[model samples]
Target chain A: GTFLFTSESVGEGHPDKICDQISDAVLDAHLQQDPDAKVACETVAKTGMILLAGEITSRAAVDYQKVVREAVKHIGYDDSSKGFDYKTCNVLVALEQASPDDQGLMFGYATDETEECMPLTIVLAHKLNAKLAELRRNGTLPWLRPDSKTQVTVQYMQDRGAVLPIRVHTIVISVQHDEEVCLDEMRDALKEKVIKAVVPAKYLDEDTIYHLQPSGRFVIGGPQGDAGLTGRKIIVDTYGGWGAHGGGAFSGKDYTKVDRSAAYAARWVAKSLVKGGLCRRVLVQVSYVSHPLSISIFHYGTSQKSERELLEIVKKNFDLRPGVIVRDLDLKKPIYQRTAAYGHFGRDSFPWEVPKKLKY
Target chain B: EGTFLFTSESVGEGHPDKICDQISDAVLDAHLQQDPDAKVACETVAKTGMILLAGEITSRAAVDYQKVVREAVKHIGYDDSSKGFDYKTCNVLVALEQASPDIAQGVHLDRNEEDIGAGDQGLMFGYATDETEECMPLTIVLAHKLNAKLAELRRNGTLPWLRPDSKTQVTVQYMQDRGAVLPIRVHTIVISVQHDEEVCLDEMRDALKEKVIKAVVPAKYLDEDTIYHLQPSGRFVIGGPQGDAGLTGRKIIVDTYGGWGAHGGGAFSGKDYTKVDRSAAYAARWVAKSLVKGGLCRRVLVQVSYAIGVSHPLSISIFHYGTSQKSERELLEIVKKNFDLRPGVIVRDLDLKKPIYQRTAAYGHFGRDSFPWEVPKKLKY
Candidate 1:
């Protein structure tokens, strides 16, 4: 009667998240000084080094080392024994002026299953990761470190003439902790202080499974555990495989690039359609090289209208050009750093998250 | 009745994303050849003439990281300084370390290789279809072939004006007939390739259609309704890592099923067989292809998930889309029975702990029969 779909996310100190933050932080540094900065900054993180590559031809004179240090320290990775030390980590900056050949394919999706108009799986995973970082920073869990990961599996059932998210089938949390902490007690602490603190009560059940730090003694993590580069977590940063990916990374690029701007616009389109009551679920795909590009829609059997009919309705309204999207979403600001963490689309802070109204 | 379309895309080895992918896999392969039980996860970043290598690799094997990275770039045709990225003079920075104790604790606890758990917790999907001779969908199959043809022309000197960074996209229309879903025809094909200024746009488009598109895609599937969009850029010169910053693991969809099936968000390159993101996905492909090969279904999708420090899979599901004669539950049973869904077992079964990943970094990992995973096994079902 039901099927399971799982999505995962990484914590702030997680290697991939650190690289994403540094990349967008570089973007923000330029945007803060010069709003019209052309930036495609990429970060590669290792044990004790932060390598910044890519092109940025901005009039803004940003101290590249200062931005890298501040970004790494802000993620709470100051101690080298645990994995990485922001204070002492070497920063190698490779900056130039660059990749405007806008050739890309991006997909955006939205569902009415959650209040955010997002798939339940990725939303829960992002929250679990956010809650883990919050508890660590707030000193509620003093032993918890920064490098961590969270995964959630949601069961969707077909009943009452519609498919519905039934419950949280499984929750997996691998939190970095001090070497001296007890494994059994750590699991209990996460079950109470982390899980109960963030996960909704309705989704939990007697039969639900929990895998906390399934790997024993998770102390070594962050860039020390593995190397990370910007845009490596494309699936985690989006709908966690709930929607198809066009293989374009969101970070390290300015909005003029169709890969970033068009994706945000497509999310706006899909979210607006579901919230406007035109469809219960939808996927919007945009492909471009020319200014007048292609906008497509698929309604996943939730509407009486066919895909072509829905496509017509979508094209009649929204303008998905990179220039129009830059104006509509107000994406020129330094708002990309926070988006580097948790999933990008579900949050309401961005102007694109503000749904558009439409008519049949 | 109304119909719909689905699209997928592919890129050449010289593209920014694939450049990074090749370097990472080359590094991983280097360690595997020297030490079979190497724990490696490498990532590469390329911007213009600058290249950086970062990741963790713990093994007895040792090689010059700069040499490997530079050779990969030169082989991808980034040798000329006029073209932006010159492998011989480009900067290659290295920052490699050992794997984490916590991750290693869970991944290598067993001695017999039977009890070791997955390197990490994640989901992976494998898909197969009877739409083509390779058991692949028409959209991505042709999309990949189109890029392959581009590489052929560039390397074979047939199209000397062609430069490296390239992309190809295919859109397939589908219709429901007699309770079966089938591909109607290719509605549109898009190709964007870097070229020298010597050749004009009109001349290039005509050449690509006859040599690239017409050669790879079958004529029967293309009609007058088939539309073509080629090289949006009027005059192209700068390309490769110089045009864009390239990162490993950024092209996950291009490296796999190309949006046809679900992905667990795990990337394949730069990771060793110990990581479920690489081996488990390969195993799922084996199972899915075997299902279709055994006449169990015309099309099938297999999904599996694993938890860290656990050798056994947490979840396994199969979706035939009602294409199989057997029910979904029975087919799932066949996968569970025939396939030993364990990390060490999969690695051993597929002979994956080798230096062969470099070959898989560019082209689609599945669909080729030369790979061990694509060889269909006899199933009890």
Candidate 2:
């Protein structure tokens, strides 16, 4: 009577997240010095080296090496024994200053299934990841390595109805650990500490299946385990494949690149609409080159108002211009480093998470 | 009956990001050609006059990294410095390392040649529709054609003034007929091309309308009222990596269904066929296209996920959006019985271990008949 929908999330120490943090750290360094700095910094990590590339035309003169090393260290990659070290890793910077001539589209989605207006599956997955990282940082699970991933599948019954609540169907967690940790011990610890602490009891059922580190072992991780690029984990950074991705990465870019700013703006719009009880779920997609072409809002029968009426209301309230989005969301500040890890949308501190005033 | 509009855009091979994609795949093919069992995860970044290659690889074959980079740029028509980047003069930096031993362990642990595990853990999606001959969406098909023609004209010297960097976006209006969706017409055709300073706006616009637009777009899909945006910002002289930074795997949408199909967000460029991100995606496309080809469904979307170090897929689900004669469950069973979703099986079944990646890097990964994934297979259903 129900269908399973799955979404995945990654921890902060993930190879992709490491690059995302390094890129955002560079962006933040520039913004802290010159708020108007134009920066599009991308980073990639391997076994013992990191490559920082992309364009930046910022007035700020900052130490690139320090920013990169500090980001790596902050993500708990300071020791070389773990495969990559902040102090020992080779840091290569290849940056240039250039005008923007790129075209991109970004999508933002929201649903009333959770308090954060995010898909239940992704929300639970992110929660599990955050809890796992907490246990590692607090020395509760000292054997836990930096790289980790979690996925959740939620079951939703749609019996000729437009709206249905979700229940937990399955949870999969793959956390990197020291070689000494046995598979049975890792599974038991994760189940008792990470999974039970994060997911709600009401959503769990007798049939719920847990796949803890199903790959057997993850002794080696981080850059050494797999080479990672900055934007490869775009889905984990956002809705975790629950919604559509415009293929534009959110990290390593300035607000001028609508790929980063417009996406934040769309999330603000969708979250506001759903948070204000206007709709149960909303998807806001904005396409643009230099200026926006059209802003499409899909309510999917969750709202009583017609699509045209909803479009009129959205047009009157939200400003889709790239410049305006940056201004409205206060995106130029040095607040992107925290967003590099975990899910970008469900976070409470980001200005884009501010609920919109429901006027209509 | 209300109208719904969907837009899809494609980048020319000369575009900065696409240049990186091609270079990465070029490196991938070079390694795969010599060592069929090679492991590659190459990533390239281009800015101004420099190209930086990074990522890990484990193979027996030694490749000339600098030569590969230069040749890729030259093939994309960026041979001259006047065009912003030159293959001969540009700097190439190579930073390669052996793949992680931990990952190698997971892949090689207790597995025979016939039952290799997935290279990594991830999900992939494949979609097909009868809207176009290619079983692709109409908007992406038209957009890809427009982009391909732009590159062709530039390379063939048909338009001497044309530069490498260009973009084409097509928006189609769809009308529902008896629960089936069909494209009514192309509502808008947007083309932005980088050109020499000497070329005037009128001349460029006229050339694009006649030589590029008319040659590629179908007559049935166009209307007199169809909007045309040629050089929307006007005077597009500066472009390519010099105008913007380029990175591999940034054009996943352009490479796949152009936003019509749901993506698991796994990029294909640079990764060897061993990576399920590339090989399984190709397999999923084959399955979806075969379904539509076999008349099982007018539209189909197939999703499959795999766990790291596992030989079998975690799940294989099919969705027709209620436009199929068979139910989703039945279709899933048919696909499971017909196609093998294991990583090793897909690599062998599709003959994916060849150097056939660089050609698919540009234009579009799907909708082309040359790739094995685009070839439809006979199905029992």
Candidate 3:
């Protein structure tokens, strides 16, 4: 008696997320040494190579080579036998001072379906994914590796425009593992430790299907298995397909680029609208350039008040500009590396996730 | 009032990001043309006077990276020898290597349909509507068509003054309900195409209206009140990769639904069909388009999720947006019975191992019937 909606998340060891981490770490490296800096640094990863490109307008002496090496080794891909030793791989730096590459649209989304005001499907997806990383580091799962991915298919009940999650219909975890472990033991262990550990029992019932890596092999992973580019994980990083997107990517970009900064500001405002109880769920949309061409909010029939009323309220409480967003959200810092993986919007630790007390 | 405004954007083949996209897809095509089972994940980064081709590619094909790079650049009209960024002299850097062998073991490529695993783990969404002739949203269809037309006239020398780098955004007002999305009319059109130093803004705008805009955008969609932005801020020289940097997969919205529906954020170019991101998305499009083409629904959204080392889809759902008389589960049942959503089965069923992705990189992938996925399957029932 329900319909299904699915969302997916990847660990920091994912090839795409690997590039995302390095790019943002490059941003963080510059921001820490110098506050007044501009960066649109992109990271591309392949076997035994990392290309750090795009523009970085900074006077800060950011040791880029040191940063890429440390970032890769930190993610646990230092093995030389796989042809990708952190210390030996080619690291190319091609950068300059620049504006946004092209004009595109970007969207921000928020919902009260979960405690974090994020979509229930993506929140569980992130938790299941992050828990895999936690197990690998904590040594709880001895055969665990860094590169892994998680997807959650949730059953939803819809009454007119209102939506609610009935249960987790399916959970998919594809994790890299050691060759020594057998498929049965790995499946049973992940089911008991990772699945039941992160997801609340209320959402897990008798019919909750679990799909692990069925082929029983994932020893090859990360940038070694697949190539990665910065901004390839936009859907995974944001709403996990629950909300719409404007096509602009988040990582390797600084606050001056409206695609990244304006997107963050839009989410901040959207979360405030929902947490302030103006709407049950919302999708905030914005467009190109510094001052922004336009800003519109969609409650999708979930708003308590009219959308017109919500817009006037948003205008009063938020500047919705680049300079004002960086200041209000305190975005100019070495804080973006952590946002590269898992899910970006649902995590409350980030400054943008701290929903403000709106003047409703 | 249940009315709202939705927007989508498109880029010309010469836009910095599009240049990177074409380059990546061209490299992928070269790899596949030589070896059908090639594993390619090529990424392109285009900066001033440089185009770096980097990624993990495992194949026996002898791909001339420089030849592919220069040809891709030249075809995008970046061939001027004196320009700071062009095919004539731009530096090419190749940092390619075999994809990790461990991944191949996990993926189990070249196996039977039931044994082969999905190349990666991800979510992909496919959507369709009877809004236009090709069954895609009008906003992105018009935008991409106009964008391709811009490139066409430039390539054909009809608009000799037209430069390569350009962008187009379309805003459409849609009649909305609780969960249904139906576009009403074209709201505004914006196009910024680079030009040579000699062309005047006034004549350029006039030529675009008469030749470019009118040719692509149907007359019914364009009214006298339609707003057109031709080169919003006046520009003459210094464009393409020279004017801006580009990273592949950055213009995904333009390549997919153009903000008409939800996206899973997995790019299609520069990867083998082993990837569920590319193959399954094509599979999902087949399902969604089948429903629309079979007169089952006016609009539909098809979704599927996959995990690595897994062949079959973990979840496949259908959202008909209240257009069909049947329940959501009913159409999902129909889809499950009729469509094959497995990873290798998808590649086998769609014949995706050929050199097909190069043309798909710049244009919208779903709307065109040229691809195998766009043709819908008739329901047996």
Candidate 4:
């Protein structure tokens, strides 16, 4: 009634996410073997073949072939006849060791909403999706397919900071499922099992409701129903349009690219500031030149508090450097596969889990 | 941000261009499995069952090109006789070659050996809005949602009569200051959903209108202020690979910002991060997001350029609307301190040396949490 905001997420099992996982897995494997490797890998899966490409330079003897096939098989793409099954699909690897990464500067950011310090809308969207994925994978809701998508539109006050209390309207989810199911039956089941399970109790006023599997029947999906490519869900992958994007795709690239590493760095910065009670609202942007040693940093701190204090806070706490990030965040580890479907900057698990260094 | 007609299209699983993307990726995977250090820029295009690959590669892996194409096609639910194309009967064309030595030379032989210049010259823009929590723009976001839902229904047999080829568009009425999403004025939703010959347009329209549209676009986003245009193209029965010849890089706009921000004119798919188009874009987004987070501005646009033989950016520009908490100049300094935009640096900064490109080919290429660029790193300087 008052304002509108929307955020969408793809399921962990969606084809694009699957491709993302495979690609990230390759990155992780590469990093595990040789943290200094320079890689630019990409992947595509459909029908029966999974294509991989990119330039790399590393001392690591990684088993990308096995990693990729296993990644596909694990995401349930293993069957031989399901159009493009994982095991039977031809695996193509266009791996190449190349020159060192072109040196360029990048950025990272965070805000002060939840503990992770992300925008409320994307944070909420991730919660819904994480829950949805858990339900789908765990079979808590059997009808919920692995390729489902969720969208939540929260209303904001005219100023665009806190969400409007009106809790205004609209929630939609399109899930793929078996053919013969009834719309009413499926809708009822989802509301009980999936929707109700995630939506916060207090937020669900009389007006708050959900549109589950809106188009009724959703059986055929994944790469079989629609074509999927990596880096397609950019908005869904990050802040859901809550922040500015620099025009980069993340699923297929390694950590050296500012597209992946710097973005993570920005989040770490933004999140720490908010966590430190430095600012009420903040957005960060960092830029870089081509030299690995010559990167530019830009930090903009927005506060419903004092500007001078925020600046002091940033200067006092953050270490904005190129060489230090990989070590500071412990990003050299092989843990990128889980980052495929969820928004990377805001996530706090597996490859991006910051819990270990919190006490630092 | 004006009243311009912006369109982003999605192809059915059977669509030829998407078919090519799948094939190219399949080949990429085949090669990567054997050798993780492969440098490939595989591109594919399709019409009927004939698929062509036109790109470059440098890898220590051998792959069965034919098997790669066939398997990719068969995976997308296009095996049936009625689907107009089958993996078993499709013609595959390979036009791939080794990457240009000149480019490779520049990449490996730079002053700052660790820094690599972008492969080509163009500009890319990364955008985020408060419209949705993901910090993404709305219309394209919603349009993608609707298009994706149509495909979901078709494959699951939830709408048994539904076929693959379809698209969706939503015209969001923005609140005057170019901020805030108002009611939807026109929902130019189109779905060329393929169905059995027996289904009439009337029946198809009824089902899509009631099921897909109603299911995808929420009512709150709609009102009497909204108008729905479904299946604007009369009979789409003869769609998908049969109706068109598709190319890989053609859908770049749909893949990013949905016309919301400026594009650098580089396609994400079929390209490695070594190419500045992909890596630089990631760097630019990192910069933009960092600036936004720095409160330098609620919004900002950063541009970086590179020459063929250079390891350093030829030029860099930063723009921060007054919303920034710091001076634009100061923000620029910070950017210089902590980030690396070079191909090698970007790869290292975001850790791009992995097999992550295939999944990014289909959807928009920005705003992801799973990928490296979305993860912000520390500025050690």
Candidate 5:
């Protein structure tokens, strides 16, 4: 017997993404100047207002208000008619210095199910969201607004060798758009351009279900319709519910914090392990401690190698230390703003996604 | 071929992020105290000398937001200025409005359907494991126990030099035999405690190893190579909100199964029962715990999803990882027959419309017997 597993993804224009982008943009503003700056910026948004709060012990001089506005403007929330205007929206700042005791835990995961090393369900979900945003930006779907969400449910059929092949079972999408676009018209365009264009034909079958905007009319969106806070989309930001999350959010933080750096390092190791043909799937977890602890390796019974041997290979190939991760990944740059949306992992643009050669 | 390390973390109540969580839940309890039908989506952020409260709330109850925030902080033992923050002096900023009518419409029923629609569209998960007596992961239970012991010593004046902020992480080595995973021994235990500058390092280490560590960690898990780290970073004199900023809902992992169970990414602090993020998660835990207590499975993870303004769940699934007495389908049948997962029904079944959330803010939310969701109900079948 088989069961269906589901995962969801949010677009760049999502309210939570808006806050995430703004917070990471601020972190970049600091890193661009003082590479040694310590920062942990958080953002919260509501109708017509954005709140910037967190700790920053940096020698860098950057305009906090300007960075916040520019991030908002870049996300296409420039018009006041959209309810959250970058030019006129109120920006509140509450920044401070880094805390020595402010520590956290994080996780990283990878699988051989897709080229991106991400689970197939989330990879497809992210592609659909990206396609939706692309159409809105390129004027292909001009009536579309900023806020959108996509969820994909895949059914896995067990194979002879204890492996599972996934097939598309359902695709659910909720997109905000102008009131002028009727529900039927919106549904037709989404099915053709957004869904059909992104999901592979091999995964879909006659029984596949498509739920477009299940709640119907969603003209009001962005910050006006709901509240958004940075780090609220932890599941969406990481593995899309595929992997375990230690609950620490990635955005608005520098590489020094284990919450951000260790997670990236774990992903790098996991991806490297799979690329090295050691396993088909791996959930690499590094618990930041005073000294070196055991590096956990979960192969999901897909590997012939023992977990202890995988740990040895990881130790030889990767430096899981927070300081070494920043140095190795070259994280002190103005690159975080680009990673705040779509999904943090499974993207080639980030340094952590760079495939590292395994020692074994 | 058999070993894996599992890690989990817990923080003391005075941690900046925890302070915000406690304050937010305290405010929620206040609103629920006055009006059971109150709709709230409160958020909080804490820094050096201020606590900013923001979100939407709609109710007839008038709450003393500032007083609640201060009292929550004070209760966490962050009242004195010498401890880096004073509850009486910290600035309190409130930016709240009425709940969005569109969201409220989904929860309150004016529709013809007999059940109340879900408050929001999202997924939630519940999990139970027999590895620990509380039916929670062993690593999280030990981590929380160590954190609680640290707090107890500080508040009771046994260790006056210890500050309110601290974090504990435990890594357990699990041995898998015939596909059944069981925790074998403690591989590593990390505890970082903030302390006064005057405290000597040697004395502090000796005291903690003797008092906190030995008191909480079970003796069976300890071994000759059991790595112990007492304040790993060393000299955490500067801590709490004064050193770092904190936002509510940041500790969702610690609040739940501590990375053991899957999460829907919905935060619990500052949200009322009307929002499915909080209530639905609680309900799922209730269902999962009841099933495990009823001997249906050794371990289980239940996932349920709902669409906004929908009275019925879009999906309700159960996963036992080949450990269920009944097949997964039969377990689902029993769940459906016994549980009414509608938003309106969950509030009554769990009795969530009350002022009990403040105690759940700091330590892990699940596993504690005090929570109504932790109380097991007999299986109907």
Candidate 6:
């Protein structure tokens, strides 16, 4: 039997998510302003300041102040108590000209496991987080703070086509809240407002348990309570601990760096392979050298069949480069702010939104 | 029959990610000295000439939070006006706060015992192999040594002109049988060391090629196939916090076995041993080392899990890969009796109650025996 696999996700307003949103917002703006702009920017945020660094070579001069402030403000950090109010926090920019990376390739993945062909563990975690965010913003449960985290542990059997999970072992939800609510009160409210709001009743049986606000009081939240940085949430950004990560973060940078663009492309590649009856699973990795346009692409597939067949399928599908993926999924838009939270994959947030055909 | 490769990277202390890691763990060590039962998860971001600290803390100890943050930066060779990030003039923002009441409730409730539950939920894996003397993989062991020695030289004036920001990469050649490393065939080492701007790329590469790589890498691992890709990117004038944004826990794979072993995705930087991410990983390493040392296996990978707010572990699984001389049940039994899986228990078992994390923040966390987390507790078979 395969090992027990689990995946987790943090909301966009979380410290790390804040950094991701800010970085992606910058990327979206740059792409929005100039479709042909060659850019790669990275960001870091903590306490009362945001550090913007990375390489960019574009024909246009972008508005640094307005872009940084608006990105921060939209993350619900408009107030100063968070230690990094968009209005007062310092924004330091060290933008340099883009040095064309020696490599560029993009990948995208899909699986028949779900409608989107994504891992269920990551999908559930992202949904749990998204539901929490909806309740907080919509005032269904107003005390819930912006910074929240959720994890899902699903058990699979040896048999195939086992749609029903054998064991829904663990569901951990740590939701930040106001100081006025008691620990038990908040836990009960979350159980109803957030947990039940998302997971279906069939999934919650007599054995189902919820670790709501497991750590008790969570009043202190956002970057004020902890330091947050861009690209630190790489695991959550992609497969939620299910797939292997190249260790590059996706936020705060334009698409020139394969860390962001290639990861997106790999997911597409995996998706196309599974949908086309080539492989049951796939994990594609791309390596780069700083001097050339060619990238080292590795399409690792684990199928119920053979490796030779999978390799043939990969050869027919998938374009391993930055230019192709950017064109494939109109990623040059202000849609990153939403993708910053939950995860870049699994969600139909932006650029990744496709119509669902599976009716389970 | 097929050409397959896996590459894991490690950064020296001068690197921006390592700098942030040092600052975060330094804060944790500060709290641990004052309150042994302290629960801290501090994160730091460094850039240009500034350091920002953020994270949750719950302790009765009274200490200058600002001073703790500065102490880590100052010691990392960023004390002066030159290296770009100067502790004296650099902006330091401390956003430390008490652990969430909900979180605190989970760890410190239901009883009056001083023991604390894991601060959060996550998975942690520990690994050991007979590939190297240090019970570590060949690539990470040598990769860590290269940059660590480089950092020491920079700080000690061993290389008078060497600046801070640097990176090191190692690629090993594994034999098909039992995955034994034949040699360090591809040293492919690159160090983007910061310099006085006056140091040209040719001169810097020339100096490091002689001093750092040759000094650290063993002669046996080197051969004709050894491709030393030094500073592949011609000029690295703008580096460290100035070149890229730095964040804590951003280098998880780097801090561990450099992709040689699987990770539970928990970051060790800026987190105390009480966090399962730090302690459990340490315990996993201990379990792996003990298995290999006991002549049970040539290699081992131990995975452990914990439910948030629980002192007892939820699951502990050992993968001996059919190499262990001992049976799975017997090995697991010995491991359970000899090891301390609780958060606080592991901190004490490994002697992790020291300020040695600053040194660990740079090199791989598993190879150094001097550090308590890497100590091997053997089980006589």
The per-prediction tally of clashing pairs is 0, 0, 1, 203, 1, 39
Question: What's the distance in Å from true for residue B207, model 1?
Answer: 3.6
Candidate 5 segments whose C-alpha is farther than 4 A from its true place: A97-106, A160-166, A287-292, A312-316, A319-324, A357-360, B107-109, B112-114, B156-162, B194-203, B223-225, B232-238
Cα RMSD, model 6: 4.9
Query: Please, what are the lDDT tens digits per residue for candidate 2 over residues A93-179?
Result: 777754334555578889887788887877887888888878888989999888988877777765332336567766778878886
In terms of TM-score, the best-performing candidate is 2
Residue B335 in model 3: lDDT: 87
Tell how far residue A129 is off in model 4, in angstroms: 3.4
lDDT of candidate 4 over B1-381, digit per residue (tens): 222222334444555555556566667667766766577777676654456676678889888888777776766656665766667876776756666454465455434637554454333555545445455666676666666676677768787766655555555554423232333344345456666666778877888778777887777766664555556667655655653455565466667676554554456666666667677887787777665554445666565644444566644555554545566567667888877677766777776666666666554566666876665555542
Off by over 4 Å in 2: A97-105, A159-167, A205-207, A287-292, B196-198, B236-238
Q: List, residue by residue over A1-360, the lDDT tens digit for candidate 6.
A: 434456777875787778777777777777776666665566665567676766666656678889889876666666654435778888878767552333322334454557656777678888888888787777787667778888777655433422335656667888777756687788787777777777767667677657777665667677655666677777677765444665666776666656676677667666655665555556654444332222223333345655555555555555555677677776666566667777778665555444212211
Q: What lDDT does each candidate get?
A: 0.82, 0.82, 0.80, 0.60, 0.81, 0.68
Estimate the overall C-alpha local distance difference test score of candidate 3: 0.80
Model 4 off-target regions past 4 Å? Answer: A80-83, A97-109, A158-168, A289-309, A350-360, B1-381
Candidate 1 segments exceeding 4 Å error: A98-104, A160-162, A289-295, A304-309, B157-161, B177-181, B194-206
Worst 10-residue lDDT window, candidate 3 chain A: A96-105
Q: What TM-score against the true fold does each predicted structure earn?
A: 0.93, 0.94, 0.93, 0.51, 0.92, 0.84
Compared with the true structure, model 5 gives a TM-score of 0.92
Per-residue lDDT, model 3, residue B118, is: 81
In angstroms, the error of model 5 at B164 is 2.6
By TM-score, rank the candidates, best first.
Answer: 2, 1, 3, 5, 6, 4
**lDDT (10s digit) by residue, model 1, range A262-326:** 88888888888888887788878776534645566767678777677887878777777677779
Model 4, A162-197: lDDT tens digits are 333345255566666654667788778766766677
Docking class of 5: medium
Give the per-residue lDDT digits (tens) of candidate 1, residues B1-381. 345567889888888888888898999898889999888888777777777777778899979887888888887888887676788898887877777766776778444687888888988999888877788777888888898888889989999889877888898888754333588889889898888768889999998899899898888889989989888656667788775778888878877887776777788888888899999999999998899889888888888888888888877778787686777878878887798979888888999887998889876887885899999999985
Over A1-360, each residue of candidate 3 has an lDDT whose tens digit, in order, gives 477888888887888899889989988988897787888787878777788767666768778789999988888776654336787888877777533234456787887788888888888888887788878878888788777788888888875466788889988888877778888999998899889888888988999888887656677766667777888888887888877877778887887777887777778888888888778888888765456666678787886687788878987887866777889888877798888887678777888888888764
- Residue-wise C-alpha lDDT for candidate 6, range B58-121, written one tens digit per residue: 7767878678777766677666665666767778767676765655556766654426687667
Q: Which 10 successive residues of model 6 chain B have the least lDDT summed?
A: B175-184
Least accurate 10 contiguous residues by lDDT in model 5 chain B: B105-114
